[PDB]
Amino acid sequence: HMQDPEQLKHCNGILKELLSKKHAAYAWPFYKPVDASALGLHDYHDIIKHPMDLSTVKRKMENRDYRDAQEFAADVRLMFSNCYKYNPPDHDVVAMARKLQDVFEFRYAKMPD
Incomplete structure (x- = not known):
């Protein structure tokens, strides 16, 4: 679609x-792939089938991997879902995820038509 480049901007x-x-206080757990080994999370890759993080989203954007906004949003949401799947809902990381997802969803919902 003709709108795809504008939407991807x-x-x-x-x-x-x-x-x-601006958002670093709660965004930082999402900056890089979860290093399960390093963190002692030896069940992480048994639970999370499709890891995702902001550095991967950035690489995919830079490489023109995303063909539309919908595809981009699916990856950002996958990142949050992995956090909600793996962690108890009262963990600080989940609170951080919800805050960053609020930033995401509110601005995503302003996308130009």
Whole structure:
């Protein structure tokens, strides 16, 4: 669609915001792939089939992997879902995920038509 490049600029804007200092207090667990070994999470890859994180979203954006906004949003949401799947709902990381997802969803819902 003709709108796809403009919409992907909006996606790129969101991505930059999610990685910005503004949100670093709660965004940082999502900056890089979960290093399960390093963290002693030896069940992580048995539970999470499709790991996702903001550095991977960024690589896919830069490489023009995403063909539309919907595809980008699915990856960002996958990242949050993995957090909700793996962690008890009262863990601080889940609170951080919900805060960053709120940033995401509110700005995603402003995408130009």
